[PDB]
Ligand binder design. Sequence first.
Ligand SMILES: Nc1ncnc2c1ncn2[C@@H]1O[C@H](COP(=O)(O)OP(=O)(O)OP(=O)(O)O)[C@@H](O)[C@H]1O
Ligand SMILES: Nc1ncnc2c1ncn2[C@@H]1O[C@H](COP(=O)(O)OP(=O)(O)OP(=O)(O)O)[C@@H](O)[C@H]1O
Ligand SMILES: Nc1ncnc2c1ncn2[C@@H]1O[C@H](COP(=O)(O)OP(=O)(O)OP(=O)(O)O)[C@@H](O)[C@H]1O
Ligand SMILES: Nc1ncnc2c1ncn2[C@@H]1O[C@H](COP(=O)(O)OP(=O)(O)OP(=O)(O)O)[C@@H](O)[C@H]1O
Ligand SMILES: Nc1ncnc2c1ncn2[C@@H]1O[C@H](COP(=O)(O)OP(=O)(O)OP(=O)(O)O)[C@@H](O)[C@H]1O
Ligand SMILES: Nc1ncnc2c1ncn2[C@@H]1O[C@H](COP(=O)(O)OP(=O)(O)OP(=O)(O)O)[C@@H](O)[C@H]1O
Ligand SMILES: O=P(O)(O)OC[C@H]1O[C@](O)(COP(=O)(O)O)[C@@H](O)[C@@H]1O
Ligand SMILES: O=P(O)(O)OC[C@H]1O[C@](O)(COP(=O)(O)O)[C@@H](O)[C@@H]1O
Ligand SMILES: [Mg+2]
Ligand SMILES: [Mg+2]
Lengths: 761, 761
Amino acid sequence: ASGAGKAIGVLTSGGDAQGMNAAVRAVTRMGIYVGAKVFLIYEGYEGLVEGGENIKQANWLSVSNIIQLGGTIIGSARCKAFTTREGRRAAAYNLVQHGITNLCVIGGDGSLTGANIFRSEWGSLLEELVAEGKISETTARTYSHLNIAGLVGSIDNDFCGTDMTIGTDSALHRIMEVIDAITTTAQSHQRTFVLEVMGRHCGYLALVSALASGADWLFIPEAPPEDGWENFMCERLGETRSRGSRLNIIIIAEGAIDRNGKPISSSYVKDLVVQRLGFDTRVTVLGHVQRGGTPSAFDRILSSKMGMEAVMALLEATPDTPACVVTLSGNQSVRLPLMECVQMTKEVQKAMDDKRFDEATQLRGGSFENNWNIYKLLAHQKPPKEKSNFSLAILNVGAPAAGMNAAVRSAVRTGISHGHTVYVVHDGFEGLAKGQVQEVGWHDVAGWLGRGGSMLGTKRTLPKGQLESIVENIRIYGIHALLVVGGFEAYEGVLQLVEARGRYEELCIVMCVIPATISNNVPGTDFSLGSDTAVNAAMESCDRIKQSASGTKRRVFIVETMGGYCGYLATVTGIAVGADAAYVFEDPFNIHDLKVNVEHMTEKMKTDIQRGLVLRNEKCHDYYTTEFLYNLYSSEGKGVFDCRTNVLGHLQQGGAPTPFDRNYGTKLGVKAMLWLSEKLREVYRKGRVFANAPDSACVIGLKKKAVAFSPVTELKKDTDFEHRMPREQWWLSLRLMLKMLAQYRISMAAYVSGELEHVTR
Amino acid sequence: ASGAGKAIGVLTSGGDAQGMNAAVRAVTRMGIYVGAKVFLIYEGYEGLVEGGENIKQANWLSVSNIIQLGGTIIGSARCKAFTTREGRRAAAYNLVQHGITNLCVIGGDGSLTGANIFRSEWGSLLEELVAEGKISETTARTYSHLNIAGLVGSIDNDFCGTDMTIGTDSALHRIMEVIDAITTTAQSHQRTFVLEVMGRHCGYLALVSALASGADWLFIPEAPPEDGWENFMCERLGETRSRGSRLNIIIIAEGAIDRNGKPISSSYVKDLVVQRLGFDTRVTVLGHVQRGGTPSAFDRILSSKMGMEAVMALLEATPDTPACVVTLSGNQSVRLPLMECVQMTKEVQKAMDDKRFDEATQLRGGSFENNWNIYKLLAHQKPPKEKSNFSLAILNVGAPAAGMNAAVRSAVRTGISHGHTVYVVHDGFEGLAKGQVQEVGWHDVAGWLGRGGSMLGTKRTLPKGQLESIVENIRIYGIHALLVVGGFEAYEGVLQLVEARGRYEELCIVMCVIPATISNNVPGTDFSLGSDTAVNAAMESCDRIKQSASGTKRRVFIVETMGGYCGYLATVTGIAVGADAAYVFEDPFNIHDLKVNVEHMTEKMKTDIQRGLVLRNEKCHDYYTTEFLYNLYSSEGKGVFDCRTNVLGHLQQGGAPTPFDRNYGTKLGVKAMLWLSEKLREVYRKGRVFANAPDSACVIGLKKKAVAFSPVTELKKDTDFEHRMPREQWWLSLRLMLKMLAQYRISMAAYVSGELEHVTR
Ligand SMILES: Nc1ncnc2c1ncn2[C@@H]1O[C@H](COP(=O)(O)OP(=O)(O)OP(=O)(O)O)[C@@H](O)[C@H]1O
Ligand SMILES: Nc1ncnc2c1ncn2[C@@H]1O[C@H](COP(=O)(O)OP(=O)(O)OP(=O)(O)O)[C@@H](O)[C@H]1O
Ligand SMILES: Nc1ncnc2c1ncn2[C@@H]1O[C@H](COP(=O)(O)OP(=O)(O)OP(=O)(O)O)[C@@H](O)[C@H]1O
Ligand SMILES: Nc1ncnc2c1ncn2[C@@H]1O[C@H](COP(=O)(O)OP(=O)(O)OP(=O)(O)O)[C@@H](O)[C@H]1O
Ligand SMILES: Nc1ncnc2c1ncn2[C@@H]1O[C@H](COP(=O)(O)OP(=O)(O)OP(=O)(O)O)[C@@H](O)[C@H]1O
Ligand SMILES: Nc1ncnc2c1ncn2[C@@H]1O[C@H](COP(=O)(O)OP(=O)(O)OP(=O)(O)O)[C@@H](O)[C@H]1O
Ligand SMILES: O=P(O)(O)OC[C@H]1O[C@](O)(COP(=O)(O)O)[C@@H](O)[C@@H]1O
Ligand SMILES: O=P(O)(O)OC[C@H]1O[C@](O)(COP(=O)(O)O)[C@@H](O)[C@@H]1O
Ligand SMILES: [Mg+2]
Ligand SMILES: [Mg+2]
């Protein structure tokens, strides 16, 4: 099973997408964990060509304390030598000199295209190399096959076969840190903010930035504006002024063009807005800033996961299996053949060159086209000449979670677009009982994307106590559907209404639960809305705490995270920060395990690493509290390290939503409203709505691959109501990666890696 | 004493510098605290002209929960009506209709110039107004004098009479957040980062940004580059590459010009660097981002202080005293006549128009010229053909503090420039005893500006125990001077060496202490290096914590801050975050005071404001701990609010230095090295250095107005060694502002406001 006797090469090439260091760290540590030799190839294909000093064998400490670093410690370089066979043969030679039959390439589309051509010629290169006399025929029959596992490291997301790339989330963090600087101030003058984003051929970042910020207009190469857009944009900005909206946001990709080949410059859009509107218009150009900063939490977790999965795919690969790209479609890890992804990239590039240009946007991926349609739908109120008798109420239940507001905004716009009469109830089920129901319009949710917490009130109170009041208010307001955005209490309350349908006819209404909570403890989904924001805040605190020793003193920090009995937040945060241990309820630990971990920390702390970090979930243990662990670690670490403690309380809660949470809540709010409309039309009979089947009350998912709708009655089997979490959680396999990255020898036969999948046309 | 029966008008105009909301809040609350009526004038001189609805009387809650908001909730507008007498008369009319004889203007140079012309014509405007029949002669003899207290709110810092303006620090926070996105990554390619800042007429933001980031080159309008700078810059970037420095930073003001009137564009510098060097060059343009984001801690404290001082100056102003600008030169509050500051601004503008152009930079202020000389000195190693036998060792003692590295970098460069032999000792006095002395060069401190903590090691150990080892190593290495960068232990250790001079001849060496600590507990200074960083991180945590209640739940947060017995950090953090109370050791409190504050909180919490925040210094009380306050507030607040707790541990510690701390540490490190060189030449006699007088061992200050050098023996009188803090601390007057902004009726007769001062030529 172990990959002993074989060597893995890891290199980065192209623009240094942040999160590459996390991927390199996971590749290295998994490679030497499974017994393989790991060789770090510096400057990418440059150092592959020159080789020699640029190829160095890695140890465990070579990738220590880099997971929080942006860029790449390996370094990347553009080399033309790898384009030609003269340098590519030298690259194959240098791999043979170290016995590196296994290569991990972490780069963009050009990097992975070069890796594909390098595999395709590996036999021919070796043949010509032995023919020229630089390697004997023996020592060439071995190494006859080169194994390539590709990782897409780029902010562009230009590789068509793959849905998400390393650094996309963090590039968007940079973009939204800058846009939040504009939108979160008290707006004074009438002004226009034009953001030039650094996508010269792919407009994905411009699109998700526009969706996350609620941009007024978007220029992307995938969908150039129609003729006469000059007037249409200026008029849109004009009615934006008439609305009283003092700020306009224009997102313009570097690759922005018109229907012809002529590029549209940010300066042109500036001067255009200045001339026709007179708004205070300044262009913001991020430039190198997009590749800057720390990697986001998502980038660190996913880079770690894909780096580990890259190594494992590289060991289980026979001479016959093709070069693969390890990626995630949805939450599911998957391997795609390198050849097909390169072919799709060539097809979209040819289509974008005025071949199938109107039909190039679909080949970019269904997610791109759907994101652009959602963006345009939410951007401007088109006139809904259609109308329906249906009316729906939107709840916020539980604790506040970052991204509830984004979900409610999208649900409101989408429901109004479908002709529904949208209500919002303040304080959740409390307000529904008390009748705090307020009909809402398009602009009542204006600017709700970036606002953290809950504009509508949230309450944890379950509906069973005031069930008579809830049915009364549903009858009064004619509520035909119910959209509940919240945590475990949201699911539990909708479950209580479904179970009470037998008693009350009025509760036979379509229900939908959008899981929105810090803890990620809601059954039926993998990611509750706002868990990403909490993870990002928690790691940022842990990074700050871990930096406080500044390399001199050697110290261990016991950090306590929230999440109730759900350990998700602790474990992913531990992965993101390189925590030695994340103690959680789902993995019960006794004093024997604590002594093992403390001795493990002590041994590590005598080595070069000086900053230790163990996380503890707030409800992991009844007795071994944070104070207990502090006393334990400080006693047993006497004369080796000092111990400190930091209980992250509501530092993980009140932050504004991360760009993932904004886009995520945006999308599933739309999807919940689409599903609500379809179910309500499917259930409307005899002149009234009567939703009695279990399928009419679902939790909108995203459970493995795509969005799902799990009936609440069916999820009741897999729900631990005492602990307020599901019984089987997908993320417990990430504990093995967490422990492996911390030198814990754990037999991870239970980890499942994504298998080969062909591209979805 | 109180200003009852009189009305104060407050307005913002110009670009909405962040921190204006803090100034408006302090103006409003101080104005109605002292009994005066406060009127909020919306959109500035616009709403002054139209008046009517745009002038509204303020209550205490009108400026509630705005201190953390950037921009200005009052709103600002450019109006040409105030330029002409037709609209200026209407402005004077609208002030008379509300009886507003007192006006606070919070704006840039154009705003304050308009306010000056409005006062100068106030009598003529009133005369023409009564002549036209819109006000009777009675009701015009009253209001015959208009009182103007100006506040400089702008990112430009273009107002010549004033050293610091509201929003400069926060604009620099935005600039350095973008630069740190570049510099803190693992550098991979050779690349150039051209940052355009909006220095369209004033180049102050570009200069301090360049100094804080260590920019390779600077374009400011004040000092245009000499002819042929094209080659000189490109060569500088060339040797930067040859050094192995993979990143170049170019700071180009918007108003970058050459010695002629031709502007230098950021695109021109880009294409120039691309053509001659080929580095991956991208321009970053901040645009509106510079005015965005939250105000920094400094901006909130200083805006609050100057807003309060503006009101007080506005009440103690007789018909004879002129219009004043409330500003701070150094740490000292001061009032400057509006006319002289406007005159200086006109003189510098005329000088910059090719009149006295080479001599315009000095009239901008001595701080500008000194900052530019320090920048150029530290930027590039010029050849020091001078040499001296003197040799000095640089220590880091105590805890790590953000900005020690910046200080050591500047001390190293300045000492090498003066021909000294610079040593750095790792781990402070421990290393000096152990002989961990390493001679240092120019590039050994490369990139130390933005690095937090200490690159040299820090230890708290005092020198008395290993005094024999210290004198031995001073003798071995020939250490003629000693630069100690650290907290109270740094001062105490230098004091121990001075007291031991009588026993050991070798300890008769010049000593200098740079105060660098989170607590700001070092006698001889007002601001220890790195206290600003701790305050900023503390408020950012408190803002995050305060935002977590999400506008519906009534919750109080007990937030525990560090700082030892020194309460500075808690109190300024309370001012920055609008904390209800900051319990500190220097203000002893008993249970009676706690009941007063808790009842005060309960009454406040029944009103519109729902998020309370009390701060507690870690060592303020022996028994009334954070847990005690939690139990107290949660018990007495039962049925009104919930209570939560958050001990900010080392979250306040390990951050990168704020831009203030980088520039501050930079400047005082230069100044300490200048003073070291002068003292060593003044003390060199008989062929050796013999420093025995008390003046040869000083703490570099910045104590009220400018930098000072306090002998450690003299500071021993005003030092509480048991509590490790000075006995008389300048900042205890800020407690009264803290308590006043929280509705505590405290007789603040002990607060001293800056008096009138003429401009320093
Ligand atoms: N068709 C190709 N054949 C061989 N090598 C290639 C090919 N394309 C690119 N490469 C090699 O991969 C290296 C990096 O590729 P590229 O310039 O396109 O950046 P990238 O990998 O796509 O990353 P990013 O888009 O984020 O900037 C190139 O220096 C080149 O040596
Ligand atoms: N926020 C936006 N950003 C960019 N382009 C936009 C935005 N809104 C509308 N557009 C573009 O303006 C053009 C016309 O807009 P509009 O939607 O009103 O008419 P349409 O024929 O119905 O287009 P659509 O297919 O989207 O329904 C379209 O090409 C559309 O892509
Ligand atoms: N983080 C935030 N906190 C508080 N208020 C915010 C935040 N972000 C935006 N706003 C407010 O939302 C208001 C509405 O304008 P905004 O720019 O945000 O979007 P919009 O153009 O009005 O509509 P849309 O939601 O479709 O984008 C703004 O006046 C702004 O004050
Ligand atoms: N000489 C003047 N006389 C009368 N009013 C003036 C004069 N200069 C400016 N003002 C008024 O002050 C308002 C704002 O001034 P200005 O445009 O120069 O911005 P500012 O106050 O300097 O702030 P900032 O520089 O940061 O952008 C103007 O709209 C104008 O009405
Ligand atoms: N980091 C820098 N940024 C901007 N201009 C610079 C920088 N360094 C040098 N210069 C400018 O380049 C010109 C020549 O530089 P240099 O210092 O080497 O000669 P100099 O005659 O001795 O000038 P200086 O008065 O500063 O001593 C000067 O006008 C100087 O202002
Ligand atoms: N916050 C930081 N943490 C760690 N290393 C840093 C940080 N900032 C810069 N560096 C490192 O400092 C190194 C030196 O280059 P840098 O850009 O910072 O300045 P420099 O040009 O070399 O010299 P100078 O100090 O005069 O500006 C960089 O390689 C970078 O890795
Ligand atoms: O798990 P939930 O109930 O869905 O909400 C998460 C939040 O609630 C908490 O339990 C804490 O809430 P409280 O501070 O009000 O007690 C944390 O887990 C987290 O801050
Ligand atoms: O007051 P000092 O001694 O100068 O240093 C400040 C730091 O030391 C502290 O006392 C805490 O240090 P420790 O965590 O190591 O115990 C805090 O006041 C602060 O983090
Ligand atoms: Mg690419
Ligand atoms: Mg100005």
